[PDB]
Every structure is written in C-alpha cells, then in structure tokens.
Amino acid sequence: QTGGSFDQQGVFVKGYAMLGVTGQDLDGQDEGESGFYRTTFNCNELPTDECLWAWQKNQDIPQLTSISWSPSSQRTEWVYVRLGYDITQYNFFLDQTEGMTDAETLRQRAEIRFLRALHYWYFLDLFGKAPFKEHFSNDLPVEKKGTELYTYIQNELNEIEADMYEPRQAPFGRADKAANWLLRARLYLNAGVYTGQTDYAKAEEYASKVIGSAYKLCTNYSELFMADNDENENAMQEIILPIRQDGVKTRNYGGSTYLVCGTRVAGMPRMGTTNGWSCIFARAAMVQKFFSNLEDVPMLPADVEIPTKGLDTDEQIDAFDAEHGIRTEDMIKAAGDDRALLYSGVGGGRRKIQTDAISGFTDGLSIVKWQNYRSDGKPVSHATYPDTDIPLFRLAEAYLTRAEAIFRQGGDATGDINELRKRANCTRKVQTVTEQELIDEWAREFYLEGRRRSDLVRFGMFTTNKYLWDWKGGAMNGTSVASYYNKYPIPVSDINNNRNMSQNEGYK
Ligand SMILES: OC[C@H]1O[C@H](O[C@H]2[C@H](O)[C@@H](O)[C@@H](O[C@H]3[C@H](O)[C@@H](O)[C@@H](O[C@H]4[C@H](O)[C@@H](O)[C@@H](O[C@H]5[C@H](O)[C@@H](O)[C@@H](O[C@H]6[C@H](O)[C@@H](O)[C@@H](O[C@H]7[C@H](O)[C@@H](O)[C@H](O)O[C@@H]7CO)O[C@@H]6CO)O[C@@H]5CO)O[C@@H]4CO)O[C@@H]3CO)O[C@@H]2CO)[C@H](O)[C@@H](O)[C@@H]1O
Ligand SMILES: [Ca+2]
Ligand SMILES: [Ca+2]
What we know:
Layout: H1 8-17, H2 36-45, E1 51-53, H3 61-65, H4 74-97, H5 103-127, E2 129-132, E3 142-145, H6 146-160, H7 177-195, H8 200-211, H9 233-236, E4 239-243, H10 256-260, E5 280-282, H11 284-287, H12 314-323, H13 328-335, E6 342-343, E7 366-367, E8 390-394, H14 396-408, H15 414-423, H16 435-446, H17 452-458, H18 492-497
A molecule of 7 linked components (GLC-GLC-GLC-GLC-GLC-GLC-GLC) is lined by residues 30-33, 55, 58, 253, 277-279.
C-alpha cells in the first residue's frame, strides 16, 4: 500500500514496533523465535559467560552454547533475516516519504534512519558486514562490509542528528539526540574491531555528550528492570531508548516475557508470572563477577534436605531461604552489590553454582534481574505477560564506554566506574582500573541485556584463551575455539540466494 494508501503515521509507528513485537516466514521456526530482540539477544548471550539455555534439545542451542555453529545455523539465519527484514521496512518508509520537507516527516525520517542505523550496527557487530540496500526494491542487496559499513552508519547518525529531539524531549519510546550520540559512542568504542583502527577519543567524546545531557542514573538499579519502568521518573531518567512492552497490548515471547518467564520456574518466590519456562540461568562465571571467590556465594548446605511438603507458598519458601541465608536479598547483601540479583534458594529445587554437565535449569543460579513487579507496588496489567519495558539504551552505557575509552587511552577511569558502583551501593570501590575489572564491570552492569558477546570480542576474550569460563567452547572449565568465530557466518540460505554476499573467513 503506497501513495494514497500509505499510512505514514502508522508505518512510522510500526518502525519502532519491530524492536519489540513479532509480526504474524521461516521453516521450523516458532513465531516467538523470530523477534528482533530475542534473536540478537541469544547471539550475544547464549555463547557467553553470562548464561545458559537449560533445554539443550532445542534446535541449534548446543551450537550457540559452545560457539560451535556453522553456516547452516538456524538461529544465525533467524537474526540475519529479521535484521534484513526490518531494514526493508525502513527503506520502504524512507522511499515513500522521500522529498517531503515538512518538519514532522523530517523528524520521522531522522528517527527511521536512526533505527535503520542501529540495525546496520547489529549486522556490523555480528557479521562484520551486511546485505546492503539504501532503497526498497526487487534488486538483490549488495555487500557492504567492515570500514565502509562502519563509515555509512556513522555518516547516517551524523546527518540525522540535527533533526532529532533534544535529550528527553521525545515521547517516551522514541529516539532522541542522546540515543544518536550513544550509538556513535558504541561504534567508536568498537571502531578498532570493525575497521582495524581504534578511535577511543571519539568514543570518549560522544559518551561525554550523553553523560552531559538531561539523562541521569536511576538511584535504585533494580527499578530499571521492573514493570513500572515506563511510569517511574527514577528509571525513566536513565532509559535513553526503551522497547515498549505491555502485558495486555504489546506482547512478545521474545520480549520482556522472555526475560521474566524464561528465567523463572514454579516454586520460585515472586515469579511475577504464572508461567516459568525454566530456560535461562547463570553460568558459574557470571556469579563470579559478584563473588571472586565462589565459596562466598550463599548456598544451601549439601547435607540439608529440602522437604517434600511445607514449601508451597512464597511465604514458606522465603522463611526456609532466610533460615539458610539464601534469599535473593541475602545474596545481594553477601555480594555487597545491588546488581547481584541472583537466586540460590530452594524455590524450584536445589541449585548448583557450577555443573559437570548441562542437565537442567537448576544447574546454575537463577537470574531475577528482570521482574514483572512495579516498584510502587501497584497492580500490573496481566497475570502472565509482563508490563516491563526493555531499556535497550541506558545512560550507564556511557559511563562504562567512557571509562573503557579513558583506560585504553592511558588515563584514570576509576571515576566513571565508581559512579556505577556507587549507584549499585557497592561496598567495594575500585582503586585502579584493569582490563579485567572493566570487562567484569560490563558484565555486572549489563548482564542479560543482549550485548555481552560484543564486549568480549572487543576485549579479545570471546574465542581466545585470554578468558575461559564454564562451558565456553563446550568444555566444563572452558576451552578456546577458532578466531573466525568472532563473527557469525552469513546464512548458507542467503549465500545461495545472493551471489553478492561472500562468506566470512574461516567458515566453509
Ligand atoms: O500447535 C502450535 C504450537 O505447537 C507447539 O506448542 C505445542 C507443542 O508442540 C505440544 O507438543 C504441546 O507442548 C507440550 C509438550 O508436548 C509436553 O511434552 C511438555 O513440553 C515440555 C518440553 O518438551 C520441554 O522441552 C520443556 O519445554 C521448554 C522449551 O523446550 C523451551 O524452549 C521453552 O519453551 C518456550 C519457547 O522457547 C518460547 O518461544 C515460547 O514458545 C511459544 C512460541 O514461541 C510461540 O510461537 C507459540 O505460539 O507458543 C509457544 C508457547 O506455547 O514459550 C515456550 C514455553 O511456554 O520453555 C519450555 C518449558 O520449560 O518443558 C515443556 C513443559 O514441560 O509441555 C508442553 C506444553 O504443554 O503443546 C504446545 C502448545 O502449548 C509450539 O511450541 C508452539 O509455538 C506452536 O504455536
Ligand atoms: Ca499505568
Ligand atoms: Ca511497559
């Protein structure tokens, strides 16, 4: 539908919706697996030191879990096709509005181009290249890779800035200048990876612009991931770009539902939902980001039995956990960090910190960072699907990005790192910053937010022996894998359909 049938406003809104909702066609793929969020999240989380997918029988899960996928990877095709599809939609909107000079359309085009740029970043970060097309048409996309792609995204962002909303002036959910600046800061931070030439001075500069804007850090970390993060100034003042989610109106199995339902199982107190999928749990390496010595991690003694009765309600579960100091609040206290939103209690069965074999959901601690509970205690909209928004872009990213840029430039990054540690009410403060502390802090601050893999690759820790974590590369204590795994392969299906695309080095 074009011309007189083109619903500009409607298509504009759908532009943003692709970030958090699945439409309504790949073979053997549940609709709930096609989302922009879920596919990119898995590609940047499942293979990392942050988490594990409990149901390994699911297609392509073992491959992603241990960094052993191939060009026939179903989950690689999923994110590749999803990213490409969203872009064709943006190109369509831009083509249909081309030539329109009214203030309204200009702003919409700026934001759409912002959204397209973000998508091209994922292509660049995940594949080092992307099936490029500036317009909507029949023509096969051409290949745009590395430096040229990097330069295109940067140029897009630089060109559309002037037309975007001032920081915190756009309707909640839409991207403003600070979102623009944050994306560029991320690009610059990883410029070394994408172009072979680092540019930390620029990453620092754009990070400072974001930090110097109206955005501010939420005083209660957990609130950023709660049901009312779209009706709480404390959380909203930090969320530069949210992915709206609603228990009744905006549902997505791969949306906040994925982060809440996917990390819970029946028996856990305060599930915030009626459905616990028991899918995502933390690896020992994740827990170690909060407990350098895993022996300090509050755990139930192995010689203590868990009653088969009397543990049916949250009240009973909590009381039992308190007796053994294993309530999440007890986990946070022992961790001396508000971000230690983990659970080792008996709700759902005995938990392990590390496992000799990936058997089930309880082989690692549970992650209760995402919640379908409002900080003000008010009712949520639905008993199953969460109202919780996904704060894709948070101000915290600017502090860690500037901190990393300063450190790599030979300066003192303690100031920026302690800004986040202070917010999380950390008992331990950083006296000096090391590469190790930085990558560890990136995990403590952003675990389960869909970016882990990218930070690891930048630190040369994703495939190498520089950092081995439980189950990395398929080995209990971790093992390395080929360096070509730092980039996902181009789906064989697209290699076959578009001769313009060349496979990434290393893959067959
Ligand atoms: O008919 C269309 C429908 O088909 C499928 O759903 C039906 C099943 O095919 C059918 O067999 C029956 O499922 C029951 C099983 O038969 C029964 O054995 C038991 O299943 C076990 C399962 O065997 C275990 O592996 C374990 O399951 C895990 C999964 O392995 C995890 O991946 C996770 O799951 C979640 C998905 O990952 C999410 O994407 C989402 O799934 C939704 C799809 O994304 C969406 O497109 C679709 O429309 O709805 C899906 C949900 O209904 O949520 C999933 C969790 O709900 O977590 C589960 C749970 O740990 O444990 C289960 C439970 O013991 O029980 C099964 C359910 O009763 O009935 C199914 C319909 O309810 C497709 O899966 C579905 O997408 C199609 O629409
Ligand atoms: Ca409300
Ligand atoms: Ca919401």
